[PDB]
């Protein structure tokens, strides 16, 4: 697949009756393989909604989404889950962590879902977590961590599967300058040494500038900005 992500006049609205509310009003987007694109926009512009749509986690009112060259709309839930497991890594905005699993098991979970070995996945997750400087909180529960630690845990969970395409929502939202720079370096190194396309939604100007393309989302329309 030359273009991993293909969007064609996609619209999405929420609410019923008078409570109806439109968000996306026709989006055209083509994402060549290996590219780095950063989405920007004001709060309440639907960036998280579009990102969720692109991964198949939701369905818009109408349009065409061709993630890795597949008709997502003409595809049941099970095949969507299978495809996401094979090729897609996702990051939430609230870190959506399971509160009854420590950090190590939380990172390990995708491998177990894919049926990987306990030992090899375990050492890989350990390497990933110490790579993020969380080596002293391996057994901590999510309630024992702070915002930065939880965000880094979510990022490690995303990185574990080594997916072809990686979606990130505010990867460096709750991090200081140096830690954010380190995380950005890790992401870009992953893309460079693995050809992994990655789509970030962030308010960081430097992180967006380091990306190949910067798209502003205004009125449910995507326009190149920088």
């Amino acid at each position: 697949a030359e273009n991993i992500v293909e969007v064609h006049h996609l619209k999405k609205s929420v609410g019923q009756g008078e409570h109806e509310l439109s968000i996306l009003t026709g989006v055209e987007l083509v994402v060549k393989r290996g590219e780095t694109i950063a989405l920007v926009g004001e709060s309440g512009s639907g960036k998280s909604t579009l990102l969720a749509i692109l991964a198949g986690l939701d369905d818009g009112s109408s349009g065409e989404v061709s993630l890795v060259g597949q008709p997502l709309h003409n595809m049941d839930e099970e095949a969507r889950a299978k495809l996401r497991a094979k090729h897609v890594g996702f990051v939430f905005q609230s870190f959506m962590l399971i509160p009854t699993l420590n950090a190590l098991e939380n990172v390990e979970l995708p491998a177990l879902l894919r049926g990987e070995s306990s030992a090899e996945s375990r050492n890989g997750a350990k390497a990933l977590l110490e790579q993020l400087g969380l080596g002293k909180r391996l057994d901590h529960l999510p309630a024992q961590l702070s915002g930065g630690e939880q965000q880094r845990v979510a990022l490690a969970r995303a990185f574990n599967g080594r997916p072809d395409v990686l979606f990130a929502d505010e990867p460096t939202g709750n991090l200081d300058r140096q830690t954010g720079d380190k995380i950005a370096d890790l992401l870009f190194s992953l893309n460079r040494e693995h050809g992994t396309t990655l789509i970030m939604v962030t308010h960081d100007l430097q992180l967006a500038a380091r990306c190949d393309r910067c798209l502003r989302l205004v009125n449910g329309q995507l326009q190149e900005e920088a």
Binding site: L57, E77, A81, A85, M96, I98, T100, E108, L113, A143
Partner: protein, 804 residues
């Protein structure tokens, strides 16, 4: 890894309360069912002691021997009683006497009180009631001419278990052996030989033999049990038995409610987790494995601990109940285990099936963002199907007893009223303005989430209705039993009283410090026909017996009057409602009675609900005063005495013609039965109410766990303890008040149907229940809520527990 995850989940408050509630429900049902079954078996064993037989077969002629041969092959013990009343001659003194021919098996159970004790009917020997040879002027060891035989007087018959009361008696009892029936030479194929057959053995053998013999019967032979001869004392036992079953059912219903709500909450707790798993590409296979594995592990752990707790409770309770029980009860059957495990499993599956499929077919982001989930299996179609399946299963388990149908009718009325009242209350409160802050907070919280509030309200209403129904039924049964056997009662009866002798004895009764009682004048006859149709041929016990009639100027005090009007005028007689029903007669029917060639006609103008349980004589027909002067007007009275018997001898010398009957043995017999039944009811009521209170506590705890986050936020903002306690008080008080108000109507309806169909007691709308149930329910819920909220708010760093 998976094990540690499961254990960590199992320690979270939500899963912990779910497991605790399920285990409590299992323990509830198992222990209550086991205790009920064991106690009912003990009651049946006790009842076997006054019947000399577990089951009775009644006929007016000999049954084929093949059935008894089958029973013996079926490993069953059989006794036979085939006798009637006939003439006897103590030399040249004719005397009517009720003989009783029994085999050597009789008395199969119980004891035969004889003077001297230890005597049984043997060939050439007869045992006679003390009045019989008191009148016949014969003594023990002498010889008496009966029919065409001369048999030796072995001894007396103080009492036999299958005696009954028979206040309208005419001739004493003469025990005698089955093998010597032909040697009497007086038995005729005329009047019924009162063919009774007693069967004894295990429950399975009796049930199989009954099913085998059911098609081999004719409409003159009745198969029954717990129906003694004459007096219907066993009816009380039957009532008690029904009550026990009802109690079990109640517990079951209670358990179901709790499980439902608990499991519902559990399912909600899983929502987001499933979404996350669906996000990580968890396929259908792995997702099913994980989720149903957690669910099944919870079910299994709950069942195991519930079983252990129930067994411990049963053992410790039966150990602690040693003084009350007369003997060790037999082991229970296995059906309580089904009644627990099956109900918990089926209710769990029914509640959890819909959310599982709903989650499996909805995009994860919609679940997370609380958006519109997939419209599959709408509640409007899911709920009726679930209710139908539940009620069908309940019918299968119960066996189509009217108790279950009455309970379901009450529940349906309760649910309908609950919906209507909830809608009206919501509409009222949306326009209402208050001033108290805790009240405002409680009202807003109740209004914000209507459907969850309605579910909680319905569950509480169901629990309150069940408890109130049980309590009122227990009260009514206890009152009825207390009225049946007064603490003092006439232990002596006088029969064969001439009219002109009424005045002397009364004075003597006034003389010997004895309170006189009613003086029912009795006339014996037979109804010739009804609506001119000769009744000869119809199979009714009344037709082939000497019916007794009386005339009362005024209303019968202890005998209630239900249908018609009182008093009946000339050619109209009040009749028993049950006899009218079994005889298929209407008011004003032309009924003619033949007696002493003075057959008189009368109509029907009133029906009285007559209970054939009290020792007080009861007559089917009450003629108008002075209507049957032609017939010989016999008289019967009763009195109570407790010290000495010389005055009895003085009375016997005074009126040797009048017969005196002692019933102290019957009073002793009935006293033990009544005491044991009352102990059974007290223990069952205490157990059920305590365990229902426990289930109510569990439901309230779950309900508060629902509102945990709001409470934590309130505390963090700085709400004082007093404000939180007051708000919880007010909210749960209103909830309990409305719930009890609905439960009042539901319980009234179910109770009315049950009384009118099962326990045959009059129903009166008791406003006392209307004023007691809601207030008590509101108080109970408020107490529980206040205590649990005070327990929860205590602690430190509550803001950290918000995430949980």
């Amino acid at each position: 890894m998976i094990a540690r995850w499961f254990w960590r989940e199992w320690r979270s408050p939500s899963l912990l309360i779910v497991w605790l509630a399920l285990s409590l429900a299992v323990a509830c049902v198992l222990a209550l069912g086991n205790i009920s079954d064991r106690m009912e078996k003990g009651l049946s064993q006790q009842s076997r002691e006054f019947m000399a037989g577990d089951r009775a077969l009644r006929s007016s002629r000999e049954v084929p021997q093949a059935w008894l041969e089958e029973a013996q092959k079926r490993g069953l013990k059989v006794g036979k009683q085939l006798t009637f009343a006939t003439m006897t001659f103590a030399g040249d003194t004719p005397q009517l006497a009720n003989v009783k021919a029994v085999d050597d098996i009789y008395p199969m159970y119980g004891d035969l009180q004889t003077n001297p004790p230890g005597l049984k009917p043997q060939a050439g020997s007869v045992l006679l009631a003390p009045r019989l040879m008191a009148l016949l002027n014969l003594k023990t060891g002498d010889t008496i001419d009966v029919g065409d035989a001369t048999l030796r007087i072995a001894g007396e018959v103080i009492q036999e278990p299958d005696s009954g009361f028979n206040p309208f008696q005419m001739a004493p009892r003469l025990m005698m052996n089955l093998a010597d029936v032909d040697k009497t030479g007086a038995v005729q194929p005329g009047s019924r030989v009162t063919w009774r057959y007693k069967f004894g053995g295990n429950e399975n053998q009796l049930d199989g033999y009954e099913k085998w013999l059911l098609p081999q019967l004719k409409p003159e032979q009745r198969w029954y049990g717990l129906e003694q001869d004459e007096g219907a004392l066993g009816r009380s036992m039957e009532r008690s038995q029904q009550f026990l079953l009802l109690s079990a059912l109640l517990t079951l219903l209670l358990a179901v409610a709790a499980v439902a709500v608990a499991m519902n909450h559990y399912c909600r707790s899983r929502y987001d987790l499933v979404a996350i798993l669906k996000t990580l590409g968890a396929g259908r296979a792995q997702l099913r494995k994980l989720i149903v594995g957690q669910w099944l592990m919870v079910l299994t752990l709950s069942a195991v601990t519930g079983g252990a707790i129930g067994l411990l409770f049963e053992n410790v309770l039966m150990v602690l109940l040693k003084p009350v029980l007369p003997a060790a009860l037999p082991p229970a059957s296995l059906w309580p285990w089904l009644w627990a495990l099956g109900t918990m499993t089926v209710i769990s599956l029914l509640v959890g099936l819909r959310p599982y499929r709903l989650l499996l077919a909805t995009q994860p982001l919609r679940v997370l963002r609380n958006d519109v989930v997939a419209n599959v299996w709408p509640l409007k179609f899911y709920l009726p199907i679930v209710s139908v399946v539940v009620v069908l299963l309940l019918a299968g388990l119960m066996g189509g007893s009217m108790l279950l149908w009455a309970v379901l009718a009450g529940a349906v009325v309760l649910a309908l009223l609950c919906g209507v009242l909830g809608w009206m209350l919501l509409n009222v409160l949306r326009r209402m303005t208050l001033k108290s802050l805790p009240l405002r907070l409680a009202v807003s919280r109740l209004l914000r989430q209507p459907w969850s509030t309605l579910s909680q309200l319905s569950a509480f209403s169901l629990s309150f209705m069940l408890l109130a129904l049980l309590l009122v039924l227990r009260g009514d049964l206890l009152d009825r039993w207390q009225q049946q056997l007064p603490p003092e009662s006439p232990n002596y009866f006088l029969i064969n009283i001439a009219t002109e002798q009424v005045a002397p004895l009364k004075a003597f009764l006034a003389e010997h410090q004895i309170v006189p009682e009613s003086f029912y004048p009795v006339v014996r006859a037979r109804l010739t026909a009804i609506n001119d149709k000769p009744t000869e041929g119809n199979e009714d016990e009344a037709l082939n017996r000497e019916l007794n009639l009386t005339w009362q100027n005024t209303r019968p005090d202890h005998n209630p009057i239900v249908a018609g009007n009182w008093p009946p005028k000339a050619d109209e007689v009040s009749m028993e409602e049950g006899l009218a029903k079994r005889l298929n007669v209407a008011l004003g029917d032309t009924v003619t009675f033949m007696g002493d060639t003075q057959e008189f006609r009368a109509k029907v103008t009133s029906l009285r609900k007559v209970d054939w349980e009290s020792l007080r004589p009861n007559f089917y027909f009450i003629f108008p005063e002075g209507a049957l002067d032609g017939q010989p007007q016999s008289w019967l009275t009763s009195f109570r005495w407790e010290n000495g018997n010389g005055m009895l001898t003085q009375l016997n010398r005074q009126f040797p013609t009048i017969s005196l009957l002692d019933i102290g043995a019957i009073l002793k017999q009935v006293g033990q039965v009544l005491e044991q039944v009352s102990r059974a009811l007290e223990v069952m009521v205490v157990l059920v109410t305590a365990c229902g209170m426990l289930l109510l506590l569990a439901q309230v705890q779950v309900g508060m766990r629902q509102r945990h986050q709001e409470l934590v936020v309130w505390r963090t903002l700085g709400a004082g303890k007093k404000l939180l306690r007051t708000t919880l008080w007010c909210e749960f008080a209103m909830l309990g008040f409305v719930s009890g108000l609905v439960a009042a109507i539901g319980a009234e309806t179910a109770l009315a149907v049950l009384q009118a169909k099962v326990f045959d007691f009059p129903w009166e709308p008791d406003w006392r229940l209307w004023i007691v149930l809601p207030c008590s329910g509101a108080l109970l819920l408020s107490l529980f809520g206040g205590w649990l909220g005070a327990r929860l708010v205590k602690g430190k760093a509550l803001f950290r527990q918000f995430a949980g």
